[PDB]
């Protein structure tokens, strides 16, 4: 019998791995390290001429070849381990993996690997590819690390630098869930806009480096987003970093540089108060 359980050690939720490690914490730590060493080397590599699922598979192989026998292989196809057993079987099921990869490949061909596009089209399309990869979940494990590097490389070849380190866990989760369940890509587009705009990335970075907590919660449990030029926000001034105010609105936190606000606007603000901020264009 091919079985999904043949991916794991007997009676365990630990994946079979080239380290022989059954302890889940120890396994996770070692995999994290091996794949982080591979990632740093991949970041420096020349990007490919064409971005497609074969490059995605290459990245997964490079990231996980020291960890998994199946590095570079997709989960829809049975995989035969060296021990003789065969494994099979975050949501596309079966043939849906191949369809998802096909659709991403078609998108990338049609949009010239996202090169030569307007900024708005670059954002709509990289967000859509990230969401499609989410849904496709083509690998047994390591999808997130592989998707991220793929998008980093894609952005690099198009002239942008992506900094995923300014995205909170809560922001990534809510953006991903909303894209998949409500078909709403707006949170994902805003995420990619922030992390590809060096000014917005720096605003978010200074916030993260200054504050462990926002509004009585760990910052990683808060959706924090950069303020956009031209927008008016109304909410509660809940926290203050040296450079920025933090405005709570519709359950999220807008990080607004004090450099973008006028003295008149600044004198107006008191921590805990409701306020209305317009960011100039």
Author numbering: 18 to 106, 121 to 312
Which of the paper's sentences describe this entry?
The structures of Bhe_BepA, Bcl_Bep1, Bqu_BepC, and Btr_BepC exhibit all features defining a FIC AMP transferase as described in the first chapter and elsewhere. So far, it has been shown that Bep1 AMPylates Rac-subfamily GTPases, Bep2 AMPylates the host intermediate filament protein vimentin, and BepA causes the AMPylation of two unknown host proteins of ca. 40–50 kDa size. All members of branch 1 are predicted to catalyze AMP transfer (indicated in green in the cladogram). This has been verified for Bro_Bep1, which AMPylates the switch 1 loop of small GTPases. Very recently, it has been shown that small GTPases of the Rac-subfamily are the target for Bep1 and that two residues in the extended flap are critical for the exquisite target specificity. With the use of modeling, this finding was rationalized by suggesting that they form two salt-bridges with Rac-subfamily specific residues. Bcl_Bep1 FIC were grown from a solution of 10% w/v PEG 20,000, 20% v/v PEG MME 5500, 0.1 M MOPS/HEPES-Na, pH 7.5, and 0.02 M each of sodium formate, ammonium acetate, trisodium citrate, sodium potassium L-tartrate, and sodium oxamate. Data for Bqu_BepC FIC with ADP, Bcl_Bep1 FIC, and B11C_Bep8 FIC were collected at 100 K on a Rayonix MX-225 detector at a wavelength of 0.9786 Å on beamline 21-ID-F at the Advanced Photon Source (APS, Argonne, IL, USA).
Proteins containing a FIC domain catalyze AMPylation and other post-translational modifications (PTMs). Among these, Bartonella effector proteins (Beps) comprise a particularly diverse ensemble of FIC domains that subvert various host cellular functions. The FIC fold comprises eight conserved α-helices and encompasses a characteristic active site loop between helices α4 and α5 that forms most of the catalytic center and the substrate binding pocket. Additionally, FIC domains generally contain a β-hairpin between helix α2 and helix α3 that is referred to as the “flap” and mediates docking of a target segment in extended conformation via β-strand augmentation.
